[PDB]
């Protein structure tokens, strides 16, 4: 896949009548469950018919209406103003297209992931250096270990709707659990290890995760950094959700004078407004301001008996500390294996204990289906088709509606606590999968090194999702691309023959400080690189040029944010009409109706609008800085903010799951933040300063909001 000419961009852009267009590609990039018996299949151009696999064994072909057929009930739905639904009624799975598909298509021994640990042997590789820890993960191992994780989550009592929180380093085990969570429909939240125990506590509370998966520690810069004792433990122990503190506050308050009780509730509520979880002390300090005010006698009359005030302080204290457990169990990966790890016998589980038991359950089920596998060694001797048949015996894949939530990732906003955006299985997977051949030359078998952490959207969408979806080996790195020296990322490229490089900008500018760092990069053979990209911050044309001369010529710039789900502004592989200069410019993809608008008191407010509205802006002039916007939705865009948990209920019957109609997360807060900027029109407003150029290119100049 790739766009040839400048004519092609514009043919596709107008051709992009949302439904028909994205529908054409989604049939091909990812597989769908189609009706005979049900089968995972996709439209294969090389075969011009739907190829695929039986949902209970091996490979057939289904010829029903092939180009025209639609595995969904309706491609595109535009009835609500910003609440879009793509491929409704279609059953798919992020886990299947990321794991099972490729084993099941005869690429089991292929390298899904290359993992590199942080620690470094300078003298390895004849003085060039090598990692201390490193592993190549076959697609069959990724399927086995994740299927084991899936059964472990089930054994913990998790159902298809429930939610988990991951607080882990970039290591292979996080992927295993993540892909295992997808296999069971369990929605997860990756919490990067750089945040604070109170951030992790807020994301647990808000996601409603009753299980957490963390680690004992990781290795950052050749030093053992604890994880569980420093994040998960305090987040669960030392914080409670504000509605729980109030509930317990009401219980404590129930031999009290109603006027005194009322003052106490409001006093604490104002100190907790906007917060998600807080330390129990924040509540007490609030009570002390209310009691001291009552002892004064000046508020709401009343006069607390010194004894009564003390009794209240005791009842409220005792209730907050005896709060109920926030989590049913915490899973702990042994990774650093440091001594004297704080342990809670009532909730802590060693991941290996649970995954091993999950293997025996996996092996027993296979034997009940007649495979004759006494041990994991026997299993990893079957063919690809029979290997995956055996896995399905005990850990089948759950097929979820296209709009089923895949994960919840939090990103900081202009006001208030960071919010969690939802990404579904359907549009999200088919969308990012398409950007790989469109922006890079990414074909199956290639290798991609994405400098990222699964806690970031680059981690979720490209390090993991777009890689496993495209059958492109991904390099998992535990540490920084410049530790110990500036040539670390170059060494990885050389030794694994990386073909695609996706990273930020800061690591390079730190390289350009002293000239000595460049020499370290020049040690390594980067000829395997056919494209790199910038993607996380504004890059100066000086950086891009430096990187063009010393890493790879085709070092493009790409713009997108957590909400975008995948790249929306990039450069096109093997295209003719679109040049590439060291100007930090980017092009909008055809399905992206990007434009730059600006507030103007005298507002024509009649630009490119496919969806208008009632309730001052104008199309910015070439070279005029304003807001960057998208006027038409697309599949892999976030659907809503995570909310309305009370009405999130999954219909789970058999190995099929859907979200009971009527749930749209916190729809209101979603539209207000992203879609209700421009009066008169419906357009997505990411909040970034960009400016259009005559040749159809864009240049970004930083965040516009706060």
In the complex with ligand ACP, which residue's Cβ is closer, 166 or 332? 166
677 binds ligand ACP (CB under 6 A): no
Determine the interface stretch with ligand ACP among 10-18, 79-87, 424-432, 534-542 (rule: CB under 6 A).
534-542
Single out the segment in contact with ligand ACP by CB under 6 A; choices: 36-44, 50-58, 429-437, 555-563.
555-563
Q: How far is CA 105 from the centre of its chain?
A: 26
Number of residues written out for the chain: 706
Q: Is the dihedral angle over the CA atoms 206, 208, 213, 214 positive or is it negative?
A: positive
Task: Provide the minimum distance between the beta carbon of 701 and ligand ACP in the complex, in angstroms, as a whole number.
Answer: 8
| Concatenated DSSP letters of 246-283 | HHHHHHHT----HHHHHHHHHHHHHHHTT-SEE-HHHH
DSSP state of 562: G
DSSP secondary structure string, 98-130? IIIHHHHTT-TTSEEEEEE-S-EETTHHHHT-E
- Residue 670 binds to ligand ACP (criterion: CB under 6 A): no
- Select the residue interacting with ligand ACP from 535, 567, 582, 683 (CB under 6 A): 535
Structural tokens at position 453 = 């952490």
Q: Which is nearer to ligand ACP, 38 or 538 (CB)?
A: 538
Name the token pair of 475.
Answer: 């390099």
For residue 697, state whether it binds ligand ACP (rule: CB under 6 A). no
Residue 56 CA to residue 411 CA, distance in Å, equals 39
The residue (of 26 and 465) whose beta carbon lies closer to ligand ACP is: 465
Site string for ligand ACP, 357-386 (x = CB under 6 A): ------------------------------
Is 299 a binding residue for ligand ACP by CB under 6 A? The answer is: no
Q: Within the chain, what is the greatest distance between any pair of CA atoms? A: 86
| CB nearer ligand ACP, residue 291 or residue 457 | 457
- Please tell me the number of Cα atoms within 13 Å of 642 on its side-chain side: 28
Q: Which of 92, 178, 277, 458 binds ligand ACP (CB under 6 A)?
A: 458
Give the nearer residue to ligand ACP in terms of CB position, either 291 or 641. Answer: 641
Task: Record the tokens describing residue 10, joined without a space.
Answer: 């514009």
Binding of ligand ACP by 558 (CB under 6 A): yes
Distance between CA atoms of 645 and 664, rounded to whole angstroms? 10
Q: Is 557 in the site for ligand ACP (CB under 6 A)?
A: yes
* 580 in contact with ligand ACP (CB under 6 A): no
Given 98, 110, 206, 688, the residue binding ligand ACP (CB under 6 A): 688
Residue 100 to residue 150: CA distance in whole angstroms: 13
Site membership for ligand ACP, residue 463 (CB under 6 A): no
Q: Find the part of the chain contacting ligand ACP (CB under 6 A) among 2-10, 50-58, 133-141, 533-541.
A: 533-541
Stretch that binds ligand ACP, among 153-161, 535-543, 614-622, 648-656 (CB under 6 A): 535-543
- Residue 562 CB-density burial (10 A; 0-12 exposed, 13-18 middle, 19+ buried): buried
559 contributes a contact to ligand ACP by CB under 6 A: yes
Helix H or strand E encompassing 700: strand 698-703
Whether residue 549 contacts residue 541, with contact meaning beta carbons closer than 8 Å, is answered with no
Exactly one of 20, 259, 537, 612 binds ligand ACP (CB under 6 A); that residue is 537
At residue 608, φ and ψ (nearest 5 deg) are -75, 100
**Are 43 and 58 in contact, with CB atoms under 8 Å apart?**
no
Judged by CB under 6 A, which of 482, 536, 556, 596 binds ligand ACP? Answer: 536
H/E run at residue 329: strand 329-333
Q: Any contact of residue 532 with ligand ACP (CB under 6 A)? A: no
Running DSSP on this structure, what letter comes out for residue 564? G
Q: Is 703 in the site for ligand ACP (CB under 6 A)?
A: yes
Cα-Cα-Cα-Cα dihedral sign, residues 551, 510, 493, 560: negative
Nearer to ligand ACP, 389 or 423 (CB): 423
Identified binder of ligand ACP from the candidate list 456, 496, 587, 684, rule CB under 6 A: 456
If one asks whether residue 561 binds ligand ACP (CB under 6 A), the answer comes out as yes
> Binding mask 406-425 vs ligand ACP (x if CB under 6 A, - otherwise)?
-----x--------------
Closest-CA residue to 133 (of 116, 121, 149): 116
Q: Is 673 in the site for ligand ACP (CB under 6 A)?
A: no
Residues lying near ligand ACP in the complex (CB under 6 A)? 411, 452, 456-458, 534-538, 557-562, 686, 688, 700, 703
């Amino acid at each position: 896949i790739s766009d040839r000419d400048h004519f092609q961009r514009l043919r596709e852009e107008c051709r992009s009548d949302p439904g028909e267009f994205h529908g054409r590609l989604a049939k091909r990039e990812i597989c769908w469950l189609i009706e005979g018996n049900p089968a995972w299949a996709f439209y294969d151009d090389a075969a011009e018919t739907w190829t695929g696999w039986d949902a209970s064994s091996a490979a057939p072909i289904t010829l029903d209406l092939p180009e025209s057929f639609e595995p969904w009930e309706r491609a595109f739905n535009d009835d609500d103003p910003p609440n879009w639904r793509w491929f409704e009624g279609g059953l798919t799975s992020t886990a299947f297209n990321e794991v099972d598909r490729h084993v099941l298509s005869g690429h089991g021994d292929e390298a899904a992931m290359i993992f590199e640990g942080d620690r470094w042997n300078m003298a390895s590789e004849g003085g060039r250096g090598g990692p201390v820890d490193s592993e190549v993960i076959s697609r069959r191992k990724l399927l086995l270990e994740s299927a084991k994780c899936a059964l472990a989550l089930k054994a913990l009592g998790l159902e298809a709707g429930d939610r988990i929180a991951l607080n882990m380093p970039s290591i292979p085990e996080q992927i295993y659990w993540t892909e295992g969570a997808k296999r069971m429909g369990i929605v997860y939240t990756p919490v990067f290890g750089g945040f604070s125990d109170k951030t992790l506590s807020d994301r647990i509370a808000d996601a409603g995760a009753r299980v957490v998966v963390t680690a004992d520690g990781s290795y950052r810069n050749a030093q053992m950094v604890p994880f569980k004792p420093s994040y998960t433990d305090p987040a669960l122990d030392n914080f409670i959700a504000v509605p729980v503190a109030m509930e317990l506050l009401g219980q404590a308050l129930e031999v009290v004078a109603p006027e005194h009780a009322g003052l106490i509730r409001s006093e604490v509520a104002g100190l907790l407004d906007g917060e998600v979880t807080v330390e129990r002390s924040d509540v007490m300090r609030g009570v002390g301001k209310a009691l001291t005010a009552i002892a004064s006698g000046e508020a709401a009359g009343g006069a607390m008996t010194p004894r009564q005030a003390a009794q209240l302080r005791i009842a409220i204290a005792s209730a907050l500390v005896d709060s109920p457990p926030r989590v049913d169990a915490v899973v702990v990966v042994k990774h650093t294996a440091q001594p004297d790890l704080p342990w809670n016998e009532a909730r802590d589980h060693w991941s290996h204990d649970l995954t091993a038991a999950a293997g025996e359950e996996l092996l027993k089920a296979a034997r009940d289906a007649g495979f004759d596998v006494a041990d994991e060694e026997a299993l990893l001797a079957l063919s690809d088709t029979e290997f995956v048949r055996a896995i399905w015996a005990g850990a089948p894949v759950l097929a979820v509606d296209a709009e089923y939530p895949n994960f919840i990732i939090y990103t900081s906003g202009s006001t208030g606590k960071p919010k969690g955006v939802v990404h579904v299985h359907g549009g999200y997977a088919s969308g990012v999968a398409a950007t790989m051949p469109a922006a890079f030359g990414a074909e199956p078998g290639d290798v991609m090194y994405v400098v990222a952490d699964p806690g970031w959207i680059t981690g979720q969408s490209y390090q993991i999702a777009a890689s496993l979806l495209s059958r492109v080996t991904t390099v998992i790195t535990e540490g920084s691309p410049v530790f110990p020296h500036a040539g670390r990322f170059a060494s990885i490229i050389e030794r694994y023959g990386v073909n695609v490089f996706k990273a930020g900008v800061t690591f390079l500018k730190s390289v350009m400080q002293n000239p000595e760092n460049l020499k370290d990069i020049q040690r390594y053979d980067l000829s395997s690189l056919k494209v790199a990209t910038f993607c996380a911050e504004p890059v100066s044309p000086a950086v891009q040029a430096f990187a063009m001369e010393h890493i790879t010529h085709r070092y493009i710039n790409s713009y997108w944010a957590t909400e975008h789900g995948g790249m929306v502004w990039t450069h096109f592989a093997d295209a003719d009409g679109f040049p590439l200069e060291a100007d930090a410019h980017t092009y909008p993809l055809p399905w992206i109706m990007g434009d730059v608008w600006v507030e103007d008191a005298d507002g024509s407010s009649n630009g490119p609008v496919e969806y208008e509205r009632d309730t001052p802006w104008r199309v910015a002039e070439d070279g005029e800085k304003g807001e960057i916007v998208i006027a038409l939705p697309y599949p892999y865009l976030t659907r809503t903010i995570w909310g309305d948990v009370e009405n999130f209920t999954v219909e789970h019957v058999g190995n099929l799951a859907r979200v009971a109609g009527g749930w749209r997360g916190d729809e209101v807060r979603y539209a207000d933040t992203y879609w209700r900027r421009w009066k008169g029109a419906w357009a997505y407003t990411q909040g970034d300063f960009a400016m259009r150029h005559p040749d159809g290119s864009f240049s970004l100049h930083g965040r516009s909001d706060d």
